[PDB]
Design a protein around this ligand. Structure first.
Ligand SMILES: [Zn+2]
Lengths: 92, 665, 169, 50, 261
DNA sequence: ACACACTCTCCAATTCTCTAA
């Protein structure tokens, strides 16, 4: 056979390298200010998400990363279990 | 066989000379043509070659033969023009029947050869083979017919009509009424022939104007000039306006719909109203060009393309990247963008309409067609007199036909009716917006109950069977009716009509419609948006409302709005005003903030708001920056109150009962 | 196929170009009949048919080239002269195939002496130097004058692409 | 309001109100222009006679 | 069969080109200078078109001063700085006017092919030396002077081409050349796939006259301790063989860049 | 034999459609 293709998958997201890093650091990473423009602060938010997306899975263009995430995010039950777990933690 | 084929071609060629010829005694250098004999039989047998053979075998070979021997250009036009000019001189003074017989039968061939072309999966392989070439030859026909003596054959065709206008309807035999259908059937073709559409067999993934044809020969501009000099517009105007008085409506009023479609098609109404001028706007446009040049310059290095050094960028966790070029040294935004731009893949992509001639339904209409001044004023005069004279009487007849015949319809007649309605109603609204001499009463037949039912029924039936082109046109017609209603309410029965228009069944349909738009072409989504804006604005001025607005707000509508909004480089200044009006409605008024916290919206506002996209001084930036400020304020508040939304922002919202309620609020 | 045009019918070029009109079978047959009718019939003022007298001497010298004066061809059947000036490469093929019929009328079995005859045109009524030639002259017949500066040796060349050859220089 | 009646239109429809040298030479000549072939056969038969 | 139309074909269009086209149109119509002797409008460019009709000419001469004073000079600027972009639009503008007033000129008996008009300009503001040609001015409108040193013989250049397939009876027409001899990409009849063995139809294709000439700097202008530079110039249409070796001439046109074919 | 241009082929990745809980 030819070599099988490599893809983004929920296992990467649920890995310790994955989504927990964002929740462990996002409060410290991003910072808005009224003292800078909308365009300024708006640009700032995307920085962290871009660098994190590269570190996670360098295949593809940033937009493609988001739009790929939509499919697995809506379909996989284990990922959804993790997400309802987050919002239960806030219900705790 | 090939020899049988060429035998028929030769038979035709001999018939192409038995017909007659000019006179070489004449010493008149040249004279006109001169007439043969058996020629009745010649014309009749040619008619048989079309009907009894080519139609029965479904070929178009016979047409190829007559095009080879140039019959139209060479004999038919001078036979007719000589008949016309002879009878004209006789009328100036103020067997002959046989001459008139020849005039009739030449015209009927002109209709046949210039008849427009249709291709399907049931057309013969012969026709499919010959489609592209006969298109070229019909283009030649259009140019020629408009050119001869500055178009004088068109006076022959209407003189034929004038014989049958002449004497009382009470006398007029069925054979007699066919002449009055035939003449109008001619002008439809002459307007309808236009440059070809390229078509190929999809076996492998890898212009059609002939050398004697050019655009100015073929443009709609030309056709206006040609008809005006040759006295057509008076005929269409007189004939349509006295239509109610006992001309048998049945024979005329569909052909006479198709004309009005076939040259309203490809005009934007604003081009007919102005709202050194050309030079002034050209200079202003050059300023815009300079701004684009400035944008390129701001991304251009001072020193040359091989001077460039190398750059390294270190992340958190001490890992490093490499990028080249001299601007990357100073601009991190550019370095970040340039870094991702190298990467190869793009996800491959998905794609609604076929079978009908180019129109608003499947072309970008931000592209005018162009008028001489005399043409501009003559065209404005023709349709203005049409509206003030003919429109109500025409619509009343054609609509009370179609209610009795809806089941039998074909896709084209549906798309004609819905794009004749739309054009004339909009143009009148614009004309009276401009000036007080105009009035809205002229188009007022559209509102009465029967037509409202019929536009509704077309939209209904088209939607259920998933016919998306009729659904698209019906969307355009139903938009205008609503627009006209809000006009008239800004001045009795109209409220009754509203209440019936906004029964619950229809709200289910009109709410449903933007949701499916996400898949389809850029026009479809634009129709959905403009209809939605109108639909909500009427019900705002009804004063029910809270039921209806909550019906609209959900994920699959928002998806369509963003998917449309990100192609803003192609769209108008006005449409973006409409989209942000809706976001103001979702975000501030309804206070359903949770819909828009989704990441591909946040990307969009950077692109569009950057020095990249929307101009620093267009009115759009007022709205956009005033929106984003408020957006990010509310987002700040939400994120600090509940940190889980950092992982929320990537994904759709979560539809579980126990956690989802707190999630959304 | 069977029917033929009149000479007056050829006054109107009916196709989109000259070459595509000459090459049609009925037109070509008409031109062939007319050229043969000219060659068998043209006269001096004294009668004394010149081409019947030239074909006679063609065999007396066992020759291969028949010579035709352009002024004679322009003095009657003028349209053929016009077509010759416009499309020589077609017209000369037809004219050569007529000249063989005319020579065999004097000398049957001349085909055993030479298989094919060439018509040579003389006294073409307009002249250029090597200055006045332009792109409009392409594929037209021209008449030119000058000094011969250099000449190659003679070689054989393959005629058709069993084999046949011809001389070249 | 307009009307554009029939009877007006019928009434108003009617009442309203160098090869350049050689080519011309040959065209005009073309427009202007068995016993006949006997001279040819006579030239052929003179070989028999002389 | 899997027949399919190019439903997506609707093209992108340059608004500046169309506006320049129909502004140059108005200049040709109504420049409306008064008579040399009297205060009466003369309309010289319409008269020049009529003159061309009288003598079957193919070139028109325009004065840059007349264009400079038109519509606050923006049109002249667009023509001057971006000639290579806008030259086709100027041609389209002139074709319509000649159609309007002298349709006998549009053609060059069987059918007659279209006349290839040539626009020409003179009386530009300043003349450059061969030594002043610099890559920043590529594609602009200029005027130059020097002494002629060589000239080539006149050659036919292929302008528009037309081909026919060997394996099937099919024809391709109006193929566009630029700098190298160029041929079709597919057989247009889908019953055949052969790309080879095209032949150029010399009757249906169209050519132009072309001549190369070579010039060098004026001797009295050479700077201190230096030697004269040279340049190659292209002449086309009704201006071939006008130049003579050893003479002094003034030229105008646009400078271009030619590849390694 | 050593880089190239071009052709051919198979296989699995992807999206679309139907069914039942
Ligand atoms: Zn082929």
């Amino acid at each position: 056979k030819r070599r099988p293709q490599v893809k983004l998958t929920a296992e990467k997201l649920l890995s310790d390298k994955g989504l927990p890093y964002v929740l462990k650091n996002a409060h410290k990473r991003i910072r808005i200010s009224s003292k800078k423009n909308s365009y300024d602060n708006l640009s700032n938010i995307i920085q962290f998400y871009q660098l994190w997306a590269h570190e996670l899975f360098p295949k593809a263009k940033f937009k493609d990363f988001m739009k790929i995430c939509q499919t697995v995010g809506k379909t996989d039950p284990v990922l959804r279990e993790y997400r309802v777990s987050l919002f239960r933690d806030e219900m705790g | 066989a090939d020899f049988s084929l060429t035998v028929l071609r030769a038979r035709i060629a001999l018939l192409a000379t038995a017909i007659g010829g000019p006179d070489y005694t004449s010493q008149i250098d040249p004279p006109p043509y001169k007439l043969g004999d058996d020629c009745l039989a010649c014309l009749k047998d040619l008619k048989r070659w079309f009907k009894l053979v080519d139609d029965q075998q479904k070929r178009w070979d016979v047409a190829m033969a007559v095009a080879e021997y140039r019959i139209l250009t060479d004999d038919l036009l001078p036979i007719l023009i000589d008949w016309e000019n002879k009878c004209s001189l006789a009328a100036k003074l103020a067997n002959k029947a046989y001459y008139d017989k020849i005039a009739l039968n030449c015209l009927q061939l002109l209709v046949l050869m210039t008849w427009p072309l249709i291709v399907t999966e049931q057309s013969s392989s012969n026709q499919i083979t010959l489609y592209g070439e006969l298109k070229k030859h019909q283009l030649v026909y259009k140019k020629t017919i408009l050119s001869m003596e500055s178009g004088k054959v068109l006076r022959a065709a209407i003189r034929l009509a004038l014989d049958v206008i002449k004497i009382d309807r009470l006398s007029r035999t069925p054979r007699d009424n066919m002449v009055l259908k035939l003449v109008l059937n001619f002008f439809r073709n002459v307007i309808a022939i236009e440059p070809g559409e390229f078509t190929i067999n999809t076996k492998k993934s890898m212009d059609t104007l002939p050398p004697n044809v050019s655009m100015d020969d073929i443009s709609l501009n030309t056709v206006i000039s040609s008809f005006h000099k040759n006295k057509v517009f008076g005929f269409l105007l007189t004939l349509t306006s006295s239509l109610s008085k006992e001309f048998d409506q049945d024979f005329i009023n569909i052909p006479l719909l198709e004309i009005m479609f076939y040259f309203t098609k490809d005009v934007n109404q604003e081009l007919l109203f102005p709202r050194t001028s050309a030079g002034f706007e050209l200079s202003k446009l050059l300023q815009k060009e300079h701004q684009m040049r400035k944008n390129v310059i701001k991304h251009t290095s001072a020193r040359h393309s091989r001077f460039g050094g190398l750059l390294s960028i270190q992340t958190p966790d001490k890992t490093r990247l490499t990028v080249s070029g001299s601007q990357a040294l100073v601009d991190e935004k550019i370095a970040l963008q340039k870094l991702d731009d190298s990467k190869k893949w793009n996800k491959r992509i998905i794609k609604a309409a076929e079978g009908l001639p180019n129109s608003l339904l499947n072309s970008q209409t931000g592209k005018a067609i162009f008028f001489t001044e005399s043409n501009g004023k003559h065209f404005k005069e023709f349709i203005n007199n049409f509206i003030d004279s003919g429109f109500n009487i025409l619509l009343h007849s054609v609509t009370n036909y179609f209610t009795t015949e809806q089941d039998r319809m074909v896709t084209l007649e549906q798309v004609e009716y819905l794009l004749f309605f739309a054009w004339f109603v909009k143009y009148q609204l614009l004309r009276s917006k401009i000036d007080n001499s105009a009035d809205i009463k002229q188009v007022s037949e559209a509102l009465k109950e029967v037509t409202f039912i019929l536009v509704s029924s077309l939209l209904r039936s088209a939607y259920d069977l998933k016919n998306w082109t009729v659904t698209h046109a019906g969307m355009i017609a139903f938009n205008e009716l609503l627009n006209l209603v809000s006009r008239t309410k800004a001045a009795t029965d109209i409220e009754f009509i509203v209440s019936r228009l906004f029964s619950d069944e229809r709200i289910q349909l009109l709410s449903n419609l933007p949701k499916i738009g996400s898949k389809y072409s850029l026009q479809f989504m634009k129709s959905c948006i403009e209809l939605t804006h109108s639909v909500l604005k009427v019900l705002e001025q009804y004063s029910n409302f809270q039921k209806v607005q909550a019906n609209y707000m959900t994920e699959p509508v928002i998806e369509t709005y963003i998917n449309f909004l990100e192609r803003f480089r192609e769209l108008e200044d006005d449409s973006i005003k409409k989209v942000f009006s809706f976001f103001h409605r979702v975000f501030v008024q309804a206070k359903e903030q949770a819909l828009l916290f989704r990441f591909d919206l946040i990307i969009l506002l950077r692109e569009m708001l950057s020095p990249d996209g929307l101009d620093r001084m267009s009115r759009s930036r007022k709205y956009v920056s005033q929106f984003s400020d408020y957006f990010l304020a509310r987002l700040k508040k939400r994120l600090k109150k509940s940190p889980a939304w950092f992982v929320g922002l990537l994904f759709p919202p979560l539809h579980n009962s126990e956690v989802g309620f707190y999630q959304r609020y | 196929l069977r029917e033929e045009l009149t000479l007056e019918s050829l006054s109107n070029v009916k196709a989109n170009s000259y070459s595509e009109w000459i090459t049609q079978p009925n037109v070509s047959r008409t031109i062939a009949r007319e050229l043969k009718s000219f060659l068998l019939e043209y006269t001096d003022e004294t009668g004394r048919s010149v081409y019947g007298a030239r074909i006679r001497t063609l065999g007396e010298m066992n020759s291969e080239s028949l010579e035709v004066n352009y002024r004679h061809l322009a003095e009657s059947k003028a349209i053929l002269a016009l077509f010759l000036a416009k499309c020589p490469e077609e017209m000369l093929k037809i004219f050569d195939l007529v000249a063989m019929e005319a020579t065999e009328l004097h000398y049957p079995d001349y085909a055993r002496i030479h298989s094919e005859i060439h018509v040579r045109i003389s006294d073409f009524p307009t002249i250029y130097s090597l200055r006045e030639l332009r792109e409009s002259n392409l594929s037209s017949l021209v008449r030119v004058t000058g000094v011969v500066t250099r000449r190659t040796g003679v070689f054989p060349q393959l005629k058709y692409v069993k084999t046949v050859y011809r001389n070249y220089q | 309001k307009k009307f554009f009646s029939k009877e007006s239109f019928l009434a108003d429809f009617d009442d309203s109100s160098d090869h350049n040298v050689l080519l011309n030479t040959l065209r005009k000549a073309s427009r202007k222009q068995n016993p006949k072939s006997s001279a040819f056969f006579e030239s052929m038969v003179e070989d028999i006679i002389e | 069969f899997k027949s399919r139309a190019l439903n997506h074909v609707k093209k992108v269009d340059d608004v500046t080109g169309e506006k320049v086209r129909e502004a140059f149109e108005q200049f040709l119509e109504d420049f409306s200078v008064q008579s040399t002797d009297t205060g009466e409008v003369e309309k010289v460019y319409r008269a020049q078109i009529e003159f061309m009709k009288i003598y079957d000419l193919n070139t028109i001469y325009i004065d840059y001063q007349h264009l400079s004073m038109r519509e606050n000079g923006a049109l002249a600027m667009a023509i001057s700085e971006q000639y290579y972009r806008f030259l086709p639009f100027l041609q389209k503008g002139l074709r319509r006017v000649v159609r309007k007033y002298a349709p006998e000129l549009l053609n060059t008996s069987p059918e007659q092919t279209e006349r290839v008009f040539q626009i020409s300009f003179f009386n530009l503001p300043t003349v450059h030396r061969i030594r002043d040609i610099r890559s920043e001015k590529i594609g602009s409108l200029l005027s130059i002077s020097g002494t002629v040193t060589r000239t080539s013989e006149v050659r036919p250049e292929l302008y528009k081409a037309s081909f026919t397939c060997d394996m099937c009876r099919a024809i391709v027409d109006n193929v566009e050349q630029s700098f190298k001899y160029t041929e079709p990409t597919f057989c247009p009849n889908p019953s055949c796939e052969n790309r080879a063995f095209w032949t150029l139809n010399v009757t249906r294709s169209r050519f132009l006259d072309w001549q190369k000439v070579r010039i060098q700097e004026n001797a009295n202008e050479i700077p201190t301790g230096s030697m004269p530079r040279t340049l190659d110039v292209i002449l086309r249409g009704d201006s071939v063989e006008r130049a003579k070796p050893g003479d002094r001439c003034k030229f105008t046109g646009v400078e271009i860049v030619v590849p390694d074919v």
